[PDB]
Design an enzyme around this catalytic site. Structure first.
Site, PDB file in Angstrom:
ATOM      1  N   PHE A  16      25.118  31.227   6.393  1.00 57.79           N
ATOM      2  CA  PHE A  16      25.751  29.988   7.341  1.00 57.79           C
ATOM      3  C   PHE A  16      25.008  28.691   7.276  1.00 57.79           C
ATOM      4  O   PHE A  16      23.894  28.675   7.575  1.00 57.79           O
ATOM      5  CB  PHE A  16      26.053  30.542   8.735  1.00 57.79           C
ATOM      6  CG  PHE A  16      27.322  31.430   8.833  1.00 57.79           C
ATOM      7  CD1 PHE A  16      26.862  33.074   8.379  1.00 57.79           C
ATOM      8  CD2 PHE A  16      28.294  31.049   9.455  1.00 57.79           C
ATOM      9  CE1 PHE A  16      28.040  33.658   8.453  1.00 57.79           C
ATOM     10  CE2 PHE A  16      29.466  32.127   9.321  1.00 57.79           C
ATOM     11  CZ  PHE A  16      29.347  33.326   8.876  1.00 57.79           C
ATOM     12  N   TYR A  73      21.689  22.425   9.506  1.00 58.25           N
ATOM     13  CA  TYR A  73      21.301  23.610   8.609  1.00 58.25           C
ATOM     14  C   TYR A  73      21.849  23.601   7.283  1.00 58.25           C
ATOM     15  O   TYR A  73      20.978  24.279   6.634  1.00 58.25           O
ATOM     16  CB  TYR A  73      21.557  24.923   9.206  1.00 58.25           C
ATOM     17  CG  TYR A  73      20.481  25.332  10.527  1.00 58.25           C
ATOM     18  CD1 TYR A  73      19.960  26.604  10.413  1.00 58.25           C
ATOM     19  CD2 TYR A  73      20.661  24.535  11.474  1.00 58.25           C
ATOM     20  CE1 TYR A  73      18.995  26.958  11.445  1.00 58.25           C
ATOM     21  CE2 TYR A  73      19.584  25.194  12.679  1.00 58.25           C
ATOM     22  CZ  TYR A  73      19.028  26.071  12.603  1.00 58.25           C
ATOM     23  OH  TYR A  73      18.109  26.427  13.600  1.00 58.25           O
ATOM     24  N   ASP A 108      20.072  34.854   7.472  1.00 60.14           N
ATOM     25  CA  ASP A 108      19.630  33.588   7.934  1.00 60.14           C
ATOM     26  C   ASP A 108      19.691  32.545   6.899  1.00 60.14           C
ATOM     27  O   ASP A 108      19.136  33.054   5.555  1.00 60.14           O
ATOM     28  CB  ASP A 108      18.559  33.608   8.991  1.00 60.14           C
ATOM     29  CG  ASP A 108      18.938  34.043  10.147  1.00 60.14           C
ATOM     30  OD1 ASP A 108      19.917  34.658  10.549  1.00 60.14           O
ATOM     31  OD2 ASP A 108      18.142  33.458  11.056  1.00 60.14           O
ATOM     32  N   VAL A 109      19.720  31.225   6.848  1.00 61.94           N
ATOM     33  CA  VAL A 109      19.863  30.408   5.922  1.00 61.94           C
ATOM     34  C   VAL A 109      18.392  29.408   5.973  1.00 61.94           C
ATOM     35  O   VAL A 109      17.885  28.921   5.090  1.00 61.94           O
ATOM     36  CB  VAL A 109      20.548  29.153   5.861  1.00 61.94           C
ATOM     37  CG1 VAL A 109      20.461  27.915   7.424  1.00 61.94           C
ATOM     38  CG2 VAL A 109      20.918  28.160   4.689  1.00 61.94           C
ATOM     39  N   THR A 125      12.743  43.942  22.933  1.00 63.47           N
ATOM     40  CA  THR A 125      13.363  43.165  23.675  1.00 63.47           C
ATOM     41  C   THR A 125      14.893  43.246  23.515  1.00 63.47           C
ATOM     42  O   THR A 125      15.743  42.436  23.129  1.00 63.47           O
ATOM     43  CB  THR A 125      13.195  41.573  23.345  1.00 63.47           C
ATOM     44  OG1 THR A 125      13.673  41.428  21.954  1.00 63.47           O
ATOM     45  CG2 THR A 125      11.933  41.379  23.538  1.00 63.47           C
ATOM     46  N   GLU A 148      21.946  39.365  17.776  1.00 57.72           N
ATOM     47  CA  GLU A 148      21.079  40.426  17.294  1.00 57.72           C
ATOM     48  C   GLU A 148      20.874  41.671  18.454  1.00 57.72           C
ATOM     49  O   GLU A 148      20.538  42.639  18.177  1.00 57.72           O
ATOM     50  CB  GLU A 148      19.441  39.897  17.424  1.00 57.72           C
ATOM     51  CG  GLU A 148      18.504  40.779  17.066  1.00 57.72           C
ATOM     52  CD  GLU A 148      16.981  39.790  16.886  1.00 57.72           C
ATOM     53  OE1 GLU A 148      16.314  39.685  17.762  1.00 57.72           O
ATOM     54  OE2 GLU A 148      16.722  39.623  15.861  1.00 57.72           O
ATOM     55  N   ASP A 208       7.695  36.088   8.697  1.00 52.34           N
ATOM     56  CA  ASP A 208       7.251  34.643   9.092  1.00 52.34           C
ATOM     57  C   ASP A 208       5.881  34.656   8.981  1.00 52.34           C
ATOM     58  O   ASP A 208       5.069  35.051   9.709  1.00 52.34           O
ATOM     59  CB  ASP A 208       7.904  34.332  10.318  1.00 52.34           C
ATOM     60  CG  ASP A 208       7.330  32.574  10.848  1.00 52.34           C
ATOM     61  OD1 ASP A 208       6.320  32.256  10.359  1.00 52.34           O
ATOM     62  OD2 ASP A 208       8.245  32.174  11.828  1.00 52.34           O
TER      63      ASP A 208
HETATM   64  C1  LIG Z   1       5.283  41.946  20.820  1.00 56.80           C
HETATM   65  C2  LIG Z   1       5.470  40.900  19.516  1.00 56.80           C
HETATM   66  C3  LIG Z   1       5.358  39.453  20.531  1.00 56.80           C
HETATM   67  C4  LIG Z   1       5.506  38.388  19.491  1.00 56.80           C
HETATM   68  C5  LIG Z   1       7.023  38.380  18.733  1.00 56.80           C
HETATM   69  C6  LIG Z   1       6.896  37.164  17.730  1.00 56.80           C
HETATM   70  C7  LIG Z   1       8.083  36.987  17.027  1.00 56.80           C
HETATM   71  C8  LIG Z   1       9.271  36.804  17.851  1.00 56.80           C
HETATM   72  O1  LIG Z   1      10.530  36.423  17.020  1.00 56.80           O
HETATM   73  C9  LIG Z   1      11.790  36.165  17.918  1.00 56.80           C
HETATM   74  O2  LIG Z   1      12.182  37.539  18.418  1.00 56.80           O
HETATM   75  C10 LIG Z   1      13.264  37.295  19.009  1.00 56.80           C
HETATM   76  C11 LIG Z   1      13.360  38.921  19.716  1.00 56.80           C
HETATM   77  O3  LIG Z   1      12.445  39.157  20.728  1.00 56.80           O
HETATM   78  C12 LIG Z   1      14.658  36.790  18.175  1.00 56.80           C
HETATM   79  O4  LIG Z   1      14.704  37.878  17.168  1.00 56.80           O
HETATM   80  C13 LIG Z   1      13.986  35.554  17.722  1.00 56.80           C
HETATM   81  O5  LIG Z   1      15.169  35.175  16.760  1.00 56.80           O
HETATM   82  C14 LIG Z   1      12.748  35.798  16.960  1.00 56.80           C
HETATM   83  O6  LIG Z   1      12.605  34.477  16.388  1.00 56.80           O
HETATM   84  C15 LIG Z   1      12.724  34.122  15.231  1.00 56.80           C
HETATM   85  O7  LIG Z   1      12.113  34.889  14.181  1.00 56.80           O
HETATM   86  C16 LIG Z   1      10.652  34.651  14.177  1.00 56.80           C
HETATM   87  C17 LIG Z   1       9.991  35.870  13.486  1.00 56.80           C
HETATM   88  C18 LIG Z   1      10.175  33.200  13.912  1.00 56.80           C
HETATM   89  O8  LIG Z   1      10.519  32.846  12.646  1.00 56.80           O
HETATM   90  C19 LIG Z   1      10.893  32.437  15.035  1.00 56.80           C
HETATM   91  O9  LIG Z   1      10.663  30.885  14.792  1.00 56.80           O
HETATM   92  C20 LIG Z   1      12.514  32.594  15.041  1.00 56.80           C
HETATM   93  O10 LIG Z   1      13.077  31.720  16.159  1.00 56.80           O
HETATM   94  O1  LIG Z   2      22.873  24.634  14.221  1.00 56.58           O
HETATM   95  C1  LIG Z   2      22.776  25.939  13.446  1.00 56.58           C
HETATM   96  C2  LIG Z   2      22.230  26.893  14.298  1.00 56.58           C
HETATM   97  C3  LIG Z   2      22.296  28.222  13.501  1.00 56.58           C
HETATM   98  N1  LIG Z   2      22.800  28.283  12.284  1.00 56.58           N
HETATM   99  C4  LIG Z   2      22.668  29.761  11.356  1.00 56.58           C
HETATM  100  O2  LIG Z   2      22.422  30.611  12.619  1.00 56.58           O
HETATM  101  C5  LIG Z   2      21.132  31.161  11.752  1.00 56.58           C
HETATM  102  C6  LIG Z   2      20.540  31.744  12.930  1.00 56.58           C
HETATM  103  O3  LIG Z   2      19.872  30.830  13.559  1.00 56.58           O
HETATM  104  P1  LIG Z   2      18.345  30.228  13.621  1.00 56.58           P
HETATM  105  O4  LIG Z   2      17.828  30.431  12.121  1.00 56.58           O
HETATM  106  O5  LIG Z   2      18.011  29.077  14.221  1.00 56.58           O
HETATM  107  O6  LIG Z   2      17.892  31.537  14.632  1.00 56.58           O
HETATM  108  P2  LIG Z   2      16.214  32.078  14.537  1.00 56.58           P
HETATM  109  O7  LIG Z   2      15.749  32.671  13.244  1.00 56.58           O
HETATM  110  O8  LIG Z   2      15.389  30.789  14.694  1.00 56.58           O
HETATM  111  O9  LIG Z   2      16.238  33.296  15.695  1.00 56.58           O
HETATM  112  C7  LIG Z   2      20.524  30.174  10.994  1.00 56.58           C
HETATM  113  O10 LIG Z   2      19.977  30.712  10.114  1.00 56.58           O
HETATM  114  C8  LIG Z   2      21.801  29.757  10.332  1.00 56.58           C
HETATM  115  O11 LIG Z   2      22.451  30.275   9.349  1.00 56.58           O
HETATM  116  C9  LIG Z   2      23.290  27.210  11.608  1.00 56.58           C
HETATM  117  O12 LIG Z   2      23.883  27.111  10.482  1.00 56.58           O
HETATM  118  N2  LIG Z   2      23.359  26.069  12.300  1.00 56.58           N
HETATM  119 MN   LIG Z   3      16.574  32.063  11.366  1.00 59.40          MN
END
Ligand SMILES: CCCCCCCCO[C@@H]1O[C@H](CO)[C@H](O)[C@H](O)[C@H]1O[C@@H]1O[C@@H](C)[C@@H](O)[C@@H](O)[C@@H]1O
Ligand SMILES: O=c1ccn([C@@H]2O[C@H](COP(=O)(O)OP(=O)(O)O)[C@@H](O)[C@H]2O)c(=O)[nH]1
Ligand SMILES: [Mn+2]
Ligand SMILES: CCCCCCCCO[C@@H]1O[C@H](CO)[C@H](O)[C@H](O)[C@H]1O[C@@H]1O[C@@H](C)[C@@H](O)[C@@H](O)[C@@H]1O
Ligand SMILES: O=c1ccn([C@@H]2O[C@H](COP(=O)(O)OP(=O)(O)O)[C@@H](O)[C@H]2O)c(=O)[nH]1
Ligand SMILES: [Mn+2]
Lengths: 297, 297
Positions: free
Chosen positions: B64, B69, B154-155, B188, B246, B269
């Site tokens: 998406f 994005y 994700d994109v 979580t 999620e 990441d």
């Molecule tokens: C005990 C560990 C404590 C530390 C945990 C560190 C990673 C946290 O991650 C977030 O976790 C959330 C659920 O709880 C969601 O999946 C969110 O999208 C994710 O962040 C996404 O994915 C991450 C990998 C990053 O790329 C962040 O920038 C994204 O927004």
């Molecule tokens: O303005 C937006 C927000 C979300 N996304 C889509 O939704 C996914 C999940 O959102 P995001 O990557 O921001 O979440 P995160 O990985 O940070 O938790 C993105 O990869 C996109 O594919 C998008 O296309 N436009």
């Molecule tokens: Mn993402």
């Protein structure tokens, strides 16, 4: 039935799987084609039982008791009652030349036994090999309508511990107890290039035991059909593979990778091979026999 | 196609699997329900490639790119061309509110891209969550008649290493990179019993990442329909799950066990988490972003 879709489980309470703790540190638990290798410690039977019960799974168990081998049936069936697929639908199929010699064995609810009258071949090698043709034939005649999975085993055996739905999958073979630790060049594959069961010294994943294989009815039908056809080609060419049906089973599973592989917990001989630490359970084991005496009049 | 029966492989030369050597000693490589957990060292990609090529497997990949994005598309697609399912038929499905903004990306043979125009929601949470509805809708409209498997990602990501047919299976989830070493109490998950995504502290296998899941078209359609329906129920009840789609994905895979689980190699990441010894490859990784800036005008 074999459900077309993943089933929905009820809430269950059990220990969390640990990503950073291997379930076994002493054995390979997945093949390089991503088929589980089934060892104690790798599976939670409560989860698997739920998944398979929710599909009302019915398992056929085939066994051949031709000529003197009817003597093995009593212990085979009595121990199967204690250990094989308990809680699930089971259909035993006893192939025999002596229907009246099948012992009376009391069965648990949801379990039944059919006696399939077949011809007895003179040579034990032929009796053993013709199991492939006979299993294949009855897949079309009976098994497709009656069961979801087929498990095909030797009769000169007894169950000593749990053998359950953890083994069920489209196609499975079992690690032969004499070779699980061996290099592929020690495997007793058929080595004559002229045989349909030929496998070169640079090929082979495992040496599978002819005494325990299975899968969905459709996959077992294809395996048994293909093995029989290979043996008939060999026969026409004046060749009999070194280990008969087991040689052809090995060729088949080399080229058609099984979707699970059972560890030697599932196929063992305790008198011959003892009880290595790597075997936490001995589930299905040989019954002592005098090969020469029991194979001939 | 997704063949009904096991396929027959040609002769292949590769190292013999070693029954008495674990393939990984540091991680769990099979779940308690006997699903492989996919890490480098568990699979021989040559065997798997042959198996899937013989079935002429077509993999669809959904992504998406809504509002800002679209900026992520060029790197996403260009790296997918280098690393995703190379050698297999691939159909990219780019869901976007700006078809004209989809970059021109050169594709290898057997690979195609379709642009699906969809609405943009104002809230990033809704954009993310409505992917479930949208994937589900297109499973019926298009994917059922067009591809064998669907991979939904994700994109805001790039491919840095091999992501191939080793992931394909009827239903898969991916271990979230932040929590693979965490105990279930720390996950979580949604903890309010008022939400359809509710999971209590004594339940849970893994914490799956919403950014990478897939399976057969039929299983993905069921998962995505079910997650959307659950989200709509929560919305009618005035509640939004803590981690949105999620949270629902996690409730779904808790009750419908995935048939493979992907390790965090497949969803990483590096800026946040480095490169731990347990990861031998980093295959699909986050592209840095300013969440607040990119999610809003
Ligand atoms: C005990 C560990 C404590 C530390 C945990 C560190 C990673 C946290 O991650 C977030 O976790 C959330 C659920 O709880 C969601 O999946 C969110 O999208 C994710 O962040 C996404 O994915 C991450 C990998 C990053 O790329 C962040 O920038 C994204 O927004
Ligand atoms: O303005 C937006 C927000 C979300 N996304 C889509 O939704 C996914 C999940 O959102 P995001 O990557 O921001 O979440 P995160 O990985 O940070 O938790 C993105 O990869 C996109 O594919 C998008 O296309 N436009
Ligand atoms: Mn993402
Ligand atoms: C390097 C290891 C060298 C040592 C290998 C030791 C076990 C050999 O095993 C035989 O192996 C044959 C194939 O090569 C057939 O499978 C035969 O049926 C089997 O014996 C059957 O199964 C056995 C387990 C015994 O029960 C035996 O009595 C049976 O006749
Ligand atoms: O006269 C015979 C010879 C063999 N068999 C069947 O063929 C299987 C394989 O034969 P056997 O067990 O003697 O082979 P082994 O395990 O010694 O290799 C037996 O379990 C029986 O099911 C039989 O029924 N009658
Ligand atoms: Mn035997």
């Amino acid at each position: 039935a074999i459900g077309e879709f993943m089933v929905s489980l009820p809430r269950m309470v059990y220990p969390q799987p640990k990503v950073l703790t291997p379930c076994r540190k002493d054995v390979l638990v997945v093949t390089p084609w991503l088929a589980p290798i089934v060892w104690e410690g790798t599976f939670n039977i409560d989860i698997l039982n739920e998944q398979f019960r929710l599909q009302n799974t019915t398992i056929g168990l085939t066994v051949f008791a031709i000529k003197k081998y009817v003597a093995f049936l009593k212990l085979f069936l009595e121990t199967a009652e204690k250990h094989f697929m308990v809680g699930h639908r089971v259909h035993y199929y006893v192939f025999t030349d002596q229907p009246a010699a099948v012992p009376r064995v009391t069965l648990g609810t949801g379990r039944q036994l059919s006696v399939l009258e077949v011809r007895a071949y003179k040579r034990w090698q032929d009796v053993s090999m013709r199991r492939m043709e006979m299993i294949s034939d009855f897949c079309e005649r009976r098994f497709l309508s009656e069961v979801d999975y087929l498990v095909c085993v030797d009769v000169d055996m007894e169950f000593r511990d749990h053998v359950g739905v953890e083994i069920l999958t489209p196609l499975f073979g079992t690690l032969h107890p004499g070779f699980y630790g061996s290099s592929r060049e020690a495997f007793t594959y058929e080595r004559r290039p002229q045989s349909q069961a030929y496998i070169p010294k640079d090929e082979g994943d495992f040496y599978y035991g002819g005494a325990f294989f299975g899968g969905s009815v459709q996959e077992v039908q294809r395996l048994t059909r293909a093995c029989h056809q290979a043996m008939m080609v060999d026969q026409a060419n004046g060749i009999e593979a070194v280990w008969h049906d087991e040689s052809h089973l090995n060729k088949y599973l080399l080229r058609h990778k099984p979707t699970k592989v059972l560890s030697p917990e599932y196929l063992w001989d305790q008198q011959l091979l003892g009880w290595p630490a790597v075997l936490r359970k001995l589930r299905f084991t040989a019954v002592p026999k005098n090969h020469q005496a029991v194979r001939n009049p």
